[PDB]
Amino acid sequence: LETTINHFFSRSGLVGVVNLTDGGTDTTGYATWDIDIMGFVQLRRKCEMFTYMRFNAEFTFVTTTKNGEARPYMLQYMYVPPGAPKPTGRDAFQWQTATNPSVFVKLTDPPAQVSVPFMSPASAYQWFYDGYPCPNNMMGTFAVRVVSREASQLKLQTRVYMKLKHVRAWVPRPIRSQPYLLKNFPNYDSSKITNSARDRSSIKQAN
Amino acid sequence: LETTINHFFSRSGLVGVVNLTDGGTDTTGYATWDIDIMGFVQLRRKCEMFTYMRFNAEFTFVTTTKNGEARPYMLQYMYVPPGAPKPTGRDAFQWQTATNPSVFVKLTDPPAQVSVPFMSPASAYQWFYDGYPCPNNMMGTFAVRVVSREASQLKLQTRVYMKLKHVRAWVPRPIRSQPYLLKNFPNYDSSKITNSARDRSSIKQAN
Amino acid sequence: VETILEVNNTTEATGLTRLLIPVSSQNKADELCAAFMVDPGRIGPWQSTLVGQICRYYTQWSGSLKVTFMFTGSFMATGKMLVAYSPPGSAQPANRETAMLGTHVIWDFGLQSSVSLVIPWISNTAGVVTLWYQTNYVVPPETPGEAYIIAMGAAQDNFTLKICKDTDEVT
Amino acid sequence: ANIVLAYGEWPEYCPTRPDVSVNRFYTLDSKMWQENSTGWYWKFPDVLNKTGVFGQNAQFHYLYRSGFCLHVQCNASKFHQGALLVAVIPEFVIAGRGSNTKPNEAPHPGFTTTFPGTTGATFHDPYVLDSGVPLSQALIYPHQWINLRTNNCATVIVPYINAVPFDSAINHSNFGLIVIPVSPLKYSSGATTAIPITITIAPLNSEFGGLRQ
Amino acid sequence: ANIVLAYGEWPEYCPTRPDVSVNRFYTLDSKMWQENSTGWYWKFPDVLNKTGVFGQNAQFHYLYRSGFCLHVQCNASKFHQGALLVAVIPEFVIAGRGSNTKPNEAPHPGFTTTFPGTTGATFHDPYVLDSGVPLSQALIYPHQWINLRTNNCATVIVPYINAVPFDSAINHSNFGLIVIPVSPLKYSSGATTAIPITITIAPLNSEFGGLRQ
Amino acid sequence: ANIVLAYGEWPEYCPTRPDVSVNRFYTLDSKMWQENSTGWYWKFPDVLNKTGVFGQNAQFHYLYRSGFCLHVQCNASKFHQGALLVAVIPEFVIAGRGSNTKPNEAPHPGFTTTFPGTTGATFHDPYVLDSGVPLSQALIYPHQWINLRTNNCATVIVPYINAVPFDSAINHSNFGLIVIPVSPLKYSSGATTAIPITITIAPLNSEFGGLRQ
Secondary structure, eight states: OTTSHHHHHOSOEEEEEEEOOOOSTTOOOOBOOOOOSOSSHHHHHHHTTEEEEEEEEEEEEEEEESSSBOOOOEEEEEEEOTTSOOOOSTTOGGGSOSSSOEEEEESSSOOEEEEEOOOOSSSSEESOOOBOOOOOOOOOEEEEEEOOSSOOOOOEEEEEEEEEEEEEEEEEOOOOOSOOOOSSSOOBOSSSOOOSSOOOSOSSSOO | OTTSHHHHHOSOEEEEEEEOOOOSTTOOOOBOOOOOSOSSHHHHHHHTTEEEEEEEEEEEEEEEESSSOOOOBEEEEEEEOTTSOOOOSTTOGGGSOSSSOEEEEESSSOOEEEEEOOOOSSSSEESOOOBOOOOOOOOOEEEEEEOOSSOOOOOEEEEEEEEEEEEEEEEEOOOOOSOOOOSSSOOBOSSSOOOSSOOOSOSSSOO | OOOBOOTTOOSSOOSGGGGOEEEESSSOSSEEEEEEEOOSSSSSGGGSSSHHHHTTTEEEEESOEEEEEEEESOSSOOOEEEEEEEOSSSOOOOSHHHHHTSEEEEEESSSOSOOEEEEOOOOOOOOEEEEEEOSOOOOOSSSOSEEEEEEEEEEOTTOEEEEEOOOSSOO | OOOEEGGGOOOOOOOBOOOSSSSSOEEOOOEEEOTTOOOEEEEGGGTSSSSHHHHHHHHSOSEEEOOEEEEEEOOOOTTOEEEEEEEEEETOOOOOBOOOOSTTTSOOOOHHHHSOOTTOEEOSOTTTTTTTOOGGGGGGSSEEEEETTTOSEEOEEEOOOOSSSOBOSSSBOOEEEEEEEEEEEEOOTTSOSOEEEEEEEEOOSOEEEOOOO | OOOEEGGGOOOOOOOBOOOSSSSSOEEOOOEEEOTTOOOEEEEGGGTSSSSHHHHHHHHSOSEEEOOEEEEEEOOOOTTOEEEEEEEEEETOOOOOBOOOOSTTTSOOOOHHHHSOOTTOEEOSOTTTTTTTOOGGGGGGSSEEEEETTTOSEEOEEEOOOOSSSOBOSSSBOOEEEEEEEEEEEEOOTTSOSOEEEEEEEEOOSOEEEOOOO | OOOEEGGGOOOOOOOBOOOSSSSSOEEOOOEEEOTTOOOEEEEGGGTSSSSHHHHHHHHSOSEEEOOEEEEEEOOOOTTOEEEEEEEEEETOOOOOOOOOOSTTTSOOOOHHHHSOOTTOEEOSOTTTTTTTOOGGGGGGSSEEEEETTTOSEEOEEEOOOOSSSOBOSSSOOOEEEEEEEEEEEEOOTTSOSOEEEEEEEEOOSOEEEOOOO
């Protein structure tokens, strides 16, 4: 039962890590993180085993401070859907928009948790698109800010844990053995090609 | 009703105690504790009364500070299944793995509580294995770390309380009367053998 | 799904020729040609197949396997070979008579050109598949006396996997 | 002959239907396979964008949907020896060969390498399929072995594999063909030093839409 | 005679079945029981790994499953007196005798002590069964009393007791036999100073698997 | 293929019966047949006295009775030419080569010549079958022609031919096999100079008796 796709993918791993400063002259405050599931090599190798995929996602935000102690401070997470403009500053108008859903949660509360459905104009996500427009499948954004009035003087460090749900896959393909070089390109190295089987002494042994 | 095995074993005793420093040059932070149920003599004497056993476990982590006051700090408990590698440092990659399940909980929250099922490749656990490969039955690991960014300067002291559940036993054997010398070996002392009945004056009395 | 094992994984080999077992007519009547292990989740020839990459994500496995050979050579060249499974326990066999007392299939080149041997019951030594020169590699005039044999391998309906775990091919 | 039906699905309909002049055996030129050859690949829906009625009705339209019936002959004498692996690959993305991690300094394949045309293109590293993926498990795709001592022909009926039921036939090559000489060619002196490989394709169940005059 | 059926289960099947030459009464050599004797124990599935067809078919195989029918005779004259306790013990692990708590400095039993073979081995401290466990409650196992004024025979039909239905018969002794002279041997002068003890075992329902030539 | 049933009788029973691990295709090593070769012969019930379970159950027993299913492959290219004669001979007694009429001065074949083992032995005078008997009428036995332009295989199902229904499998070779290149091997330069000959035998209907541990 633990060999199906729904158990091969559905497990709350760690996708991303977002920093935040909220300082003085560099009064950024916000921290946008374009969300793609190809961050860490493990999930990319498990997701490039297939050609087409379709899934919902559960997102869990676990926010700590620099040292680690957490004081009660309001935080706004904001999901910018595909096509909507990203926020530019801490207090721009793209923060008070009603289309962009927000989650208001304190630091002392349990970690935040939302769910994002299938949001592609095609019938399924495709990672290998042979042609000309990388494809145009996207999931959105997750800009986060400290809700306050007087500038907060702390630097947080959020973690974004993703779990896939209701996963369906199509057109299996072999597993990438060569190392990675870029994010959105399967570029390998021409020289120094690593063999898929470690060498042994001779062909008439069992090493 | 309180003489069955399910009431003879199912009671949340104390199995282990784990320390933690999270300091400077000895920046360990993590604290791994290989989990075996033969820690304290009482449970070992109650579990070596039988030859084969089969049970689920409930694990409760009660974490305090050195003095005892508890401030809100995020903590990660991580269950390393049998066969998976243990974490080596505080921020190694074995902490961001998706296979190893984790529990994120603060100090001010109620104590953590998880459940581990029967995880042996055989049909039941055996404590007495007459032969050559101690056997190869194992339960896993429970590495714990302070989730932070800037090093926490506190030293905690976790307690691991285990409760057995759905216990089944087979092939009863007599109760060990001699003292213990090792953990994984029933080595007794050749000299100074303690008698299983205290001495009295004569054989024709009732002392 | 059948998948070409990398049985020739020794050194001094280029990229593709690691997938081929060389058979020649210079080798003597009775001699060893090629031998390999069975364990798919082990550093060796089974690291290049697909079952050897999937059985790395899981920490326990069971069930039978199937190793199928295929002879790429001339049409006019015949000869016999002895494929031989030796179960776990003792080490690799030494002579052809010790191998033919274990599990063995006599595969010739005249009629059959692709033999298949089913390996029973293997789990987390693990078994040894040997491949011996039975008689010779005869070849008529004006024909190259050097051919290749591709080894392929897959699981069976009994193959069951347990305990999920992240792999270690990546860093 | 034995037909390997790709993914167990027949190419079916769902737009004009020519049904007369496009369901004919388009025969590509033969490739000369030699000792030191590496392999060949063909991006399909732009192989036939320059050949006759199918090219005319695929360039002047905007939407496209069809399957294919492939046929790969490789006729050699009874004294040659070797083996080919013919396999279709859905969404066969050619990777770039380099060791650069910067965006506009890393190499990328050109237009002639990604879309070879009606003359095909050869591999550079056939051990990694020019995509960083080892070919040893490339048998996960629909495939056949052309073994030069058992048969000389292969055939693949491949349906329409795409996420959108209609797509442009010019800016998106659906799937590719890859022939690879796993076992090299060997022959005694005095024989023909090169073996021809012939490919004929039939566009089963073609559908075209939105034609711009 | 009275038969004590171990744990109320008959040895049953679940692999080859000899059924002819291994279901015979293998008779071990007699042990000379004397005044100052201590006891004897036998690890069973490696007692018969050197004796004939069962040893051949248990060494050349890899998987093993069988029960046993034991028979322990102890024939003494009507003027001798004493008592024996014969008991089977599943997973009889011999402990080491010492007072060291360090891992590689604490004592451990050798290969000849853990696996005695077809000649058995004697105890050192029969009061603790050489396992730190008192023998007074060793009657929790299947057992009989050989009392030299009531009977001279004992028999134990013991089934297969293991967590895995197949296991190696060379690196894992399933269960052991232990004969212990609880009441010592006494006799007037002029009688036979030693009493023989004879053990015959029958491997009921043997099953072997995975034979490596 | 065409099977020549020896003497029109199937090997039948009449003692233990293994029926599992001895009814498998024992494959002997291939013999390199060349231009100047002479022939080969094999004494059967002592070919398999050193190979695995059949050798174990034939050395440790005293009575023996079985038939055999033979298979002789000889795979050559379509440019080689020649012919073999494969024939079984009941009670194939090797004669000695000499010209002496005195009892203890006349030559006699050694143990390695009469019982070759699992590696066979070659003839010295194939025209007289090394027995003073001309091979031209050796077609009186069960036999086949392995002609290298029609087939490459032969098979002989041979029953038990003996005057006593049980006999020792160590001191009495029942019957022998003889392959003889009647027409020599011919090939043009550049071809494989030696042709392999492979023999696989199956002990149909084996019966063993009187086993001495």
